[PDB]
């Protein structure tokens, strides 16, 4: 009905309506990072997604 991996999590599953194999992968996420020259110099900032 479903598969697993080394992490023992959900990565593949069989739909209960048809016979087509599906795959489960989480979408894009991560910790946001910031680059700034400091408040004493300027105010422009460069936001970064890691």
């Amino acid at each position: 009905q479903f598969g697993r991996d080394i992490a023992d999590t959900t990565d593949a599953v069989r739909d209960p309506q048809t016979l087509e194999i599906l795959d489960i992968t989480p979408c894009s996420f991560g910790g946001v990072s910031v680059i700034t020259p400091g408040t004493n110099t300027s105010n422009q900032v460069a936001v970064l997604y890691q």
Binding site: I6, A7, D8, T9
Partner: protein, 49 residues
Amino acid sequence: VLYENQKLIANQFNSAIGKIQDSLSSTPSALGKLQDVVNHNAQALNTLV
């Protein structure tokens, strides 16, 4: 003592280079530290998940 046997020490250096080139791939256990740290990180991630 350098220029008395310059050809001899050049041949010895080439032989040592060939010997270490053979010995780097002679056994798969000559890089134990990198394999150990990689396996330790992989096992830490595996027990974490």
